[PDB]
Design a binder for this molecule. Structure first.
Ligand SMILES: Nc1ncnc2c1ncn2[C@@H]1O[C@H](COP(=O)(O)OP(=O)(O)OP(O)(O)=S)[C@@H](O)[C@H]1O
Ligand SMILES: [Mg+2]
Lengths: 152, 261, 157, 258, 261
């Protein structure tokens, strides 16, 4: 039928395990509406995408998840046309929905170049109150220290 | 079985050029009240509601509710096919995969049956809160279109200020500031120039320019335009098109700069 | 920052007198067509005197003032063109990228019969940074040089 | 010597704006009968037969039969600044490289003499097209241009079908299916609006819409166009201008029928 | 404090649409005589001399002589947001840099204050010779505009001739030869359609077509235009505004050297 990972993917903050300090701090930030730009980094398959999707489905309903969350991944090439393309135009716009920030899930953020990470640094620092980025990556050291210095 | 007949063909031939460049598709919802069309833009900023009631049609046959998804690229060239004073009809079967638009050719000699396919699009209704608006303005339509064309030469984001004095449209660009303020135009012969203010508390909202130009693409539908705005409610542009129904545009404001002292 | 100490006459130039003398000789050689008036040093003096065009023009119509980017060659060309009876209409090849606006700034700006309000003040063309120009612009200038209307005003590249 | 003065310049300007993208060059044959122009495309897709009789002009003088071929766009630059109501003087010598247009376009007595050069092209010969068309339908021309634009809006190729009721147009594409179906409307006050029927042996064909648009860019040239089609013979549109001559356009059908 | 009240915005609109494709930046001299604009183009070939008298405005006030310089395309886009029946208020003060254009709209209800930012360019004033010429021909302006558009197609630069008979236009282009000659056009009912020859000495001079085309964009300012040609002083195209002032365009020739043979 379906693979077991797509069947038994965790959908709750308690259903993800061994990240209890991280999930506690994320819940503390998201109950008080103080969530920053996130940078989740680590080995593959340890619960990076599913944690932020659980947090997105905590923040947003099923109807507005497809509107106030933009997902980019390995299918999208990460150069300089993307950062001046859909993600900038997504982050620089308001929504007719409830007055909350947007969300951009950028899978494999360690594959961006230094120029691309600097342009993303410009986009992140320009728009903060209406967009909260989420860069998830394998290696922290493959991104610039300015990008590490603007997102938690 | 859905069957609708218009009184004059020019209703679609003025209402569908306003959706030529704004929205990408059309979601027709059928009901005993009539037809409606709610579509959000691809950038999720602009929202279009089109509500045509059943009493405005010449004849109207419907049995159950239907959701219908069509492409506006070929429809926006099929509007050029029909005439201006002919009679148009929309026909839709129960299980068919094509809808028919049956009208008369501009030669007044030839029956025109244009068949358009259905795109099975999975969309959901947002749901307008329909809150009490903090400022309502009644204005002419061509005046609003020419003031958007006027502030299209200055800056890419106009500023609508609405106080008890009236409405101030201000554009600031690299060239220089330009502001236009209206007040108390009830001393006119025709009733369509009554630029009236209906609420007290002032608001100041910055809107995009290309979106307001796409909104003012719908001038000859009606004579007057109702602009509703509040502190956090989006801009509502209401057109009372003829007697069959109305049209609404919903526009989120732009993001304000960090101008804290 | 060169406010009042700018050179304006032939007695304020900071180059060697042979180069300025031959540059002034080349500038005054055009008086037969513009105004209608009737070692390597010896090679230059032979090529500046022996043989001309049938239309009273020199063999070369463009001077290449090659050197380091400083050392005031532009100011030298300005004060020499002021001294020889012309007016300096300078232009720049670095802000001009499109060939259409280049031909606007060259073939539609100068080197025609630009009889201005000052009838006693004709004009000459001074072009800086010709090395950084794209090859289409220098091919256009080569086609202007090889045009046989006829090119009468001097070009100081 | 050759000389022809057209009474009004809107006909010549409008036909040269009609075939501005159809052909690449215009070749006039000059005789005592009038001005003959028979042009054929490079890809064997369309043919133009324009005849201007000598009685339609105020003065037409011709000594020897001539054949002058000039690149269209060059004369399009000439008559893009002409007048709607003006006297046009088209002249050439017997053996000369030039061709002159003298006109008084804005009614401001500005005698504008414009000369252009002749292009020596290869003389290909097309004597007489065969005219044994079973299906003949007279239709008003401006609304024919309207429905040509209508069919060009939706599809890329037009399926045409004659029938005893009239002429049925169709087109198909991945966004929709355009269809239109003629009816007899002879009970109108306008004689141009009536459609005349001389059709037998109905034939279904397919055509390219852009060539139909290039044909029907000459909407205001005549009040009534004529369509003539049959099996495996190219379709003819025909404008009979009331004064100076006639114009015919030939389009071969596509290989992929229906 | 400089304040000028243009009676109608149509003449300003036609002035700016004439000067839009020619001048990089426009300089105004303000005195009790009125307003002056003596400037060169972007290529230092042509000259513009606009004079607006003091009595033509509704209210014209000026304390000290002012030498302002403004960007021209910015002012074209500012003036594009204006009607044709509205009074125009040009405002400037003694010790600042903002130029204000305050006018009414075609609604005739709303004020419109468009601010602009001037330039700090010091331009040497070139003395106009104000001498006599070799030929003066009076001709309606629509004739000159249509013959410039008609003669732009045949060639790239055109030689014009004037003699005792009339005026002559010649073009040796890549298509071929284009030659027109008009004289004695005074025998009509209208007073505008008239060509008058004043002087004696015949002149033949060649000029670029694009500068003539940009000169002919002042067409509906004046019913009649004046052309002054001379062998040494440049070509003069003068549009006389009816009750406001005048506008002169000066054009320098091009090189046409004879063949050596
Ligand atoms: N903490 C966890 N508890 C339970 N199941 C988990 C946990 N983390 C991961 N899984 C399972 O492993 C799968 C992979 O999780 P994901 O977060 O989607 O992968 P990832 O952490 O984003 O790493 P990538 O995408 O390969 S770089 C999930 O769909 C679950 O089936
Ligand atoms: Mg992932």
């Amino acid at each position: 039928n379906l693979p077991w990972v797509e069947k038994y993917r965790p959908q709750t903050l308690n259903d993800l395990i061994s990240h209890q300090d991280i999930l506690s701090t994320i819940q503390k930030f998201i109950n008080e509406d103080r969530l920053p730009h996130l940078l989740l980094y680590g080995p593959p398959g340890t619960g990076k995408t599913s944690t932020i999707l659980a947090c997105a489905k905590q923040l947003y309903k099923d109807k507005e998840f497809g509107s106030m969350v933009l997902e980019l991944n390995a299918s999208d090439d990460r150069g300089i046309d993307i950062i001046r393309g859909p993600i900038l135009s997504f982050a620089s716009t308001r929504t007719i929905f409830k007055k909350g920030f947007k969300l951009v899930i950028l899978d494999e953020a360690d594959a961006m170049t230094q120029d691309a990470q600097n342009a993303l640094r410009r986009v992140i620092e320009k728009f903060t109150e209406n967009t909260r980025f989420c860069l998830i990556c394998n290696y922290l050291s493959k991104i610039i220290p300015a990008l590490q210095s603007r997102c938690t | 079985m859905f069957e609708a007949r218009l009184v004059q063909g020019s209703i679609l031939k003025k209402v569908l050029e306003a959706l030529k460049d704004l929205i990408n598709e059309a979601c027709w919802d059928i009901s005993s009240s009539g037809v409606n069309l709610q579509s959000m833009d691809s950038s999720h900023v602009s929202l279009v509601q089109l509500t045509l009631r059943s009493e405005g049609f010449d004849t109207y046959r419907c049995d159950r509710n239907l959701a219908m998804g069509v492409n506006l690229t070929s429809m926006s060239k099929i509007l050029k096919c029909a005439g201006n004073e002919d009679i148009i009809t929309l026909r839709a079967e129960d299980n068919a995969d094509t809808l028919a638009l049956v009208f008369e050719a501009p030669n007044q000699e030839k029956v025109s049956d244009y068949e358009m396919k259905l795109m099975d699009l999975d969309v959901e209704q947002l749901g307008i809160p329909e809150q009490e608006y903090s400022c309502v303005v009644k204005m002419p339509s061509g005046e609003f279109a020419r003031i958007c064309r006027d502030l299209s030469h200055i800056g890419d984001a106009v500023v609508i200020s609405c106080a008890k004095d009236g409405v101030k449209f201000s554009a600031s660009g690299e060239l220089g500031n330009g502001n236009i303020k209206l007040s108390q135009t009830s001393n006119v012969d025709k009733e369509e120039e009554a630029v009236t203010i209906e609420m007290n508390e002032p608001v100041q909202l910055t809107f995009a320019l290309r979106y307001l130009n796409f909104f003012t693409k719908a001038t000859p539908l009606s004579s007057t335009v109702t602009l509703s705005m509040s502190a956090d409610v989006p801009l509502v542009v209401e057109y009372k098109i003829a007697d069959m129904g109305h049209l609404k545009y919903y526009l989120a404001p732009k993001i304000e700069d960090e101008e804290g002292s | 920052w060169v406010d009042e100490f700018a050179p304006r006459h032939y007695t304020e130039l900071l180059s060697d007198d042979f180069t300025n003398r031959c540059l002034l000789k080349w500038l005054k050689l055009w008086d037969l067509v513009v105004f209608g008036h009737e070692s390597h040093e010896q090679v230059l003096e032979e090529m500046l005197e022996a043989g001309l065009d049938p239309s009273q023009r020199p063999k070369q119509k463009v001077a290449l003032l090659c050197g380091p980017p400083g050392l005031g060659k532009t100011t030298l060309a300005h004060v020499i063109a002021r001294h020889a009876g012309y007016s300096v209409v300078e232009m720049n090849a670095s802000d001009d990228r499109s060939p259409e606006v280049f031909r606007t700034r060259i073939e539609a700006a100068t080197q025609m019969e630009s009889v201005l309000g000052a009838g006693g003040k004709p004009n000459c063309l001074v072009i800086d940074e010709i090395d950084g120009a794209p090859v289409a612009a220098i091919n256009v200038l080569l086609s202007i040089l090889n045009r046989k209307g006829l090119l009468m005003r001097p070009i100081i590249c």
